[PDB]
Amino acid sequence: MNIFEMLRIDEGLRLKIYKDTEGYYTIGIGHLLTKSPSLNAAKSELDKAIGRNTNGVITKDEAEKLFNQDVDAAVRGILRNAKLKPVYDSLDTVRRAALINMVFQMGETGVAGFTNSLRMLQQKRWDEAAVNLAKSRWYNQTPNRAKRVITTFRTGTWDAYK
Ligand SMILES: [Cl-]
Ligand SMILES: [Cl-]
């Protein structure tokens, strides 16, 4: 298992513009287009991202290209973030994938906000960190996905994804 595979299971793949869990226009493998409630604004962001008149449909390849860019961005963002990098540096490979997934979903800023859980993860207090992460809107809104990432941090294994 690896990050790409993990996120692919979490986000799925849609080739047409769709609304995510929060009702925002998205395409591909969880690529957010815009938070504006206008479909036109979305189509325009879409063609701007792909570089062609898409009419709101992209191919698989185009989806995977946005995904590759998005994973790269996530990692980079983490490494650039003063709160995040030290956490990432401290972790094992599997747990690093769990942090990336969170960053992919919520952005670097939202993650950086889980101060207390970050701290627990850095100290390697697994069971505690897992309880604290569960007290969040994140877990309450997308509980199955959150359980999966949480279990990953708790165990340092991919079992949640098996
Ligand atoms: Cl983009
Ligand atoms: Cl969920």
CA 26 to ligand 1 center in whole angstroms: 12
Q: Where are the domains of the chain?
A: 1-162
Q: Note the resolution in Å, 1 decimal.
A: 1.7
Cβ atoms < 10 Å from Cβ of 146: 19
3-state helix, strand, coil in the chain (%, to 5): 65, 10, 25
Give the largest Cα separation in the chain, rounded: 50
CA 120 to ligand 1 center in whole angstroms: 33
∠ Cα 34 35 38 (to 5°): 80
Residue with tokens 């946005």: 66
Give how far the C-alpha of residue 86 lies from the chain's centroid of Cα atoms, to the nearest Å. Answer: 19
For residues 136 and 26, give the distance between their C-alpha atoms in angstroms, rounded to a whole number: 23
Edge-first strand order for the sheet with 14-19 is: 14-19, 25-28, 31-34
Contact 13, 30 (CB under 8 A): no
Active-site residue, from 20, 47, 64, 128:
20
H-type alpha helices, 12-125: 39-50, 60-80, 84-90, 93-112, 115-123
Fold of the CATH domain 1-162: Lysozyme (1.10.530)
Residue 16: what are its φ and ψ, rounded to 5°?
A: -115, 155
For residues 106 and 103, give the distance between their C-alpha atoms in angstroms, rounded to a whole number: 5
Of the listed ligands, the closest to the CA of 67 is: 1
Cβ atoms < 10 Å from Cβ of 82: 7
For residues 104 and 153, give the distance between their C-alpha atoms in angstroms, rounded to a whole number: 16
Residue 45 annotated to the active site: no
Ligand 2 ion local residues (Cβ < 5 A):
142, 144-145
Helix H or strand E encompassing 14:
strand 14-19
For residues 133 and 153, give the distance between their C-alpha atoms in angstroms, rounded to a whole number: 10
Q: Could you tell me the two tokens for 9?
A: 């299971």
Residue 25: what are its φ and ψ, rounded to 5°?
A: -65, 130
